Amino acid sequence: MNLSNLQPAEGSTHNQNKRVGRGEGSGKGGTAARGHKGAKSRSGYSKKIGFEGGQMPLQRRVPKFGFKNINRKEYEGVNLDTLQLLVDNGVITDSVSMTDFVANRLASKNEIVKILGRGELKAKLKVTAHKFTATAKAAIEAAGGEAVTI
Amino acid sequence: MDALSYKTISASKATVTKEWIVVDAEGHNLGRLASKVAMILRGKYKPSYTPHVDCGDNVIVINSEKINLTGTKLNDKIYMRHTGYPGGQRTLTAKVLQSKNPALLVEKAVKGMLPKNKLGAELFRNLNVVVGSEHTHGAQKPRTVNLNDL
Amino acid sequence: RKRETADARKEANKSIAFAKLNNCPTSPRKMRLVADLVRGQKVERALNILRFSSKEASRKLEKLLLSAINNWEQKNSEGNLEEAGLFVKEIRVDGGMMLKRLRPAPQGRAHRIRKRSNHVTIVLGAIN
Amino acid sequence: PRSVNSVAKRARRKKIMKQAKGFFGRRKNVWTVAKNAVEKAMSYAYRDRKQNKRNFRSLWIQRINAGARLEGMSYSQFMGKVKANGIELNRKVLADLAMNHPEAFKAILNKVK
Amino acid sequence: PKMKTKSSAKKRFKVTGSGKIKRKHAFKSHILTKKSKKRKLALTHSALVHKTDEKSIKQQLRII
Amino acid sequence: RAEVTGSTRKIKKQKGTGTARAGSVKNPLFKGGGTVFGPRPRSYSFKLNKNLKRLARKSAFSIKAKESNIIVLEDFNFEAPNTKNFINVLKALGLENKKSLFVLGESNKNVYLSSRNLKASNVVTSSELSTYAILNTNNLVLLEGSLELIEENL
RNA sequence: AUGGAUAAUAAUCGGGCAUAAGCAUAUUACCGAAGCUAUGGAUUUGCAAGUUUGCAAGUGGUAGGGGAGCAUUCUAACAGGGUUGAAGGUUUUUCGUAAGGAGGGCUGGACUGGUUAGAAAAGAAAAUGUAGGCAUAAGUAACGAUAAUGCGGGCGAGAAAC
RNA sequence: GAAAAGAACCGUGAAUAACGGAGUGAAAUAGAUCCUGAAACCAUACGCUUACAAGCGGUCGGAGCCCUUUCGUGGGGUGACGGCGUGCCUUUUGCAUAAUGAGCCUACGAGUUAACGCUGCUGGCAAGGAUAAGUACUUCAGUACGGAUCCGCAGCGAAAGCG
RNA sequence: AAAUAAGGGCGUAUGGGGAAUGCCUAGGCUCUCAGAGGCGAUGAAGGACGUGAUAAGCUGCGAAAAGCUGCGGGGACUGGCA
User: Which residues form a coiled coil (chain B) (predicted)?
Assistant: First the structure.
């Protein structure tokens, strides 16, 4: 209502008074929160991630495998279910080109689109894509118009 | 704020009434008589006994020379009287001790059944142990009490 | 409270006759020995005791009593002095600001020496 | 901003030191000696409260025994015959009667005997 | 600054589709002539990182 | 501990001195040492979504609309800056001794200068409105012309 | 029950002491804990009514884990107090489970602070911790080559040392 | 101290050492050790106890004697006498330990921040969510724009690839 | 005059001691905006010695020595801290 009656939602604010090492009675006092002596109770202790106590860790007992292809072509991936849900709420009519994929945030500006076949597309569409699957092409060309590869 | 409203009244020095009991120790065992004498001296046969006040009576044992021990204790009872110097532990006997001031038997028997405090050292001054058959108090009018009526 | 009113109420020293000796270069523990012989005595027995005391802390304490007597005579101008029969009501020997000096002890160390002072206060009172 | 708890730092210890009033030596003015003595005093005061309830019962029992042995009885027999008679008077009231009202005490004794 | 991913753990330990970490088996390096074909066939398929090591592997791969 | 003007030299020997071991006078527990875990130059700004921000600015208008603290003028204009004239036109509206926020649609430098000296009135253009500015005042005065920009911006 | 050696500062049923107040069996009454119960009150989970009450099970605690809060310094809004006496210091009364809040007298002579929200140089009893002040040992060690001093005059309030 | 108006003058004192007066001031118990001025520490006066009584000095009971009083199964002070009771911290299976540490008081003193993440609560939008650098205006360390880019929506395989 | 237990303990009051706390600022810290980034052989930075009606220090100034001249501003006090 006013600047003197500000009240947040119930559960958004918390204690903010919890400090470690403030006398016995507030919980964490004396040996603040690190128990008794040891390496884990000294100032500046940091857990070595790969360290396993001294023995060989799992990230060093397991062999390496595989390589990476420099010319890997990864497509976006659009399903017939998503295409039908996009043609129901009318934004595309009889033509789904590479522009209706950018206007609807389905693919970036300079990428490659591959139409997959997970769905039950029923409407007749004329799609233009880079690649098709054996299911998507057979479900488009039979249940509607053509499917051109660009 | 004194929220009790019902307190246990304790006797004071201005309310106690001390008597002058006289006890005949002709036929009596040492400890069997000393227990009752110490109880009378402390004061526990009055329904006004306060543990921190010098209540009770004054006892006058009038036949201490005629006391007896049961077994061969008159010949096998030892009293240790260490002096404080190296090798200064003296040992007496019940037969030798009663040859000089036979009242010491009853005196040391009674002293030992007392609270061993300032009140308990002030109670020993109320006990009069006479070796003969007549005391020297005179104008106090003491009454005789048989220890078998308690 | 009004400070002028509090001061005018506390300025009741127009009757009591007292004397003070501040910043005396003597220790308080050595003057408290001679103050005990004077505390409570008559104003002339105290003078005799201070004049014949075998202590150096009495040469300057015997004239503080004379100054107190003179202050009493100034305050009670109307009246003689021997008819009143003065005595020593209260006499207090307090501490004072001490000086700190250094003494070189053996093997390259230094010890501290505190030259102590003391304050003396005396009030007379009268028998009448 | 710089926050210093200077006033309340000493106002907190003044209250804990004001209850060490009457202690011998420096246990009443020195802070680290008074605090160590006030906490032990409170520890002693927590107990002795369970002992005040069993040190008064002993006195009541002793006074009842003294008042009952004047009539040729004992505390054990008197309490037995009282409890197995439907009386239900606590030892506090019984000792108060034995001390202040011997007529009432002997009346109770003759009724239960 | 930005948490660096451990290279020894990033060259191994491929992350699966939903929540698991896929790795390879050991002991199949240079003494394979005396081990039974059953062991060599079992140690060929990829395995999953156990739940006791999953926390350490995820801390190494910078997926807390 | 590092910025204190001193020297990083051990004060006393390690052993044989009888006192506590120490050195490097710039340590925090000495008189004149560094302040351990003290303040640092910081920035206290955090991020809120510009959808939540406009939702809050809309709620701030709805609160005033519910409390009935909204007036509308006809976009007056002053020839010369006059605090006297600006105070003269405050009782016709009833904002005397009350906190008012005049929301203009245009610069109106004269009207701003005629209220730069008052503490019970604030002239703010629509291009600089804020949730805090709306909540601070006690009565909004939206000039005819500023509503067209306030409505078609949320 | 009896004999079968005992260790060095004075010893032991804990002591007095007991011929039963020792031992064996049986019975009764009583004493005896923060155990159980009687009375008053507080709190945690689970179940219902509502917007605190009722019932059930609980409520020792180190390392450790969780939840509600107090004080301190400053800031944003609204509402205040003060030379007819603010902060601070010293006593006293009262309230709360506690950290703490409020009121009165004395000194003091100019600032202070309620409600909601926010931030942190946000709380000491110990680190042979640091700086300042002040005690104890105590009127004690010592007053620094065992070459040596005595008397009479002088100044002077004051002289073993001039 | 608002301003030196910083104590003329008199007395004790050998003394221009100190003090008591007298004047200045609202204050001199604001007097140059100068605002208020606590604690440790050192003393004086008054009330109650204490010279036959053994120990972490307290606690629970308890007379007697002094002040106050709404008059009281009210308050304050001291307490003769009785019961119980071997400080604190740290390290340890285990410390009164004769294991460590501190003479006391006052002041300082130890889990804080930045970047990148993860869990619990809360909020906006929602198959979508969010901007970074920067730019424009302005009453200027303080609304609009900016979609580059990041996460999610499809995974498997070392990879070609399939989906 | 009084009191008196040689002395000690507790409570209250009044003193000395000390500098904490409270309030204040002469000084510092981190920065924003706009400039500038050098002095010196026509003798630098940094000093020594001198200079006053009176002059121990600090400040200013150099044997023309708490100062000299020219152009503007200013209008009653001035001979630095003093």
Answer: none
* Cβ contacts of B34 within 8 Å, gap of 6 or more: B106, B109, B110, B113
Taking alpha carbons only, the member of B19, B6, B20, B11 closest to residue B52 is: B11
Cβ within 8 Å of residue C92, ≥6 positions away: C35, C120, C121
Yes or no: say if F75 and F143 are a contact pair by the CB < 8 Å rule: yes
SS (H, E, C) D5-59: CHHHHHHHHHHHHCCCCCCCHHHCCCHHHHHHHHHHHHHHHHCCCCCHHHHHHHH
Nearest in space to B63 (alpha carbons), one of B147, B149, B122, B150: B147
Give resolution, Å, one decimal: 2.8
Strand I reaches within 7 A of the D22 CB: yes
Cross-strand partners of C100 = C114
**Which one of E11, E49, E62 would you mutate to disrupt binding with A, by most A Cβ within 10 Å of its Cβ?**
E11
| DSSP strand pairing (F70-73 vs F139-143) | parallel
D43 phi/psi in degrees, rounded to 5: -65, -40
How distant, in Å, are the alpha carbons of A21, A22, A30, A47, C22 from that of A25? 10, 8, 10, 30, 52
Compute the CA torsion angle A86, A88, A94, A96 (nearest 10 deg): 0
Contact E8 A50 (CB under 8 A): yes
Locus of tokens 């309340």: D8
Q: What is the DSSP letter of F151?
A: H
For residue E19, give both structure tokens. 């929540």
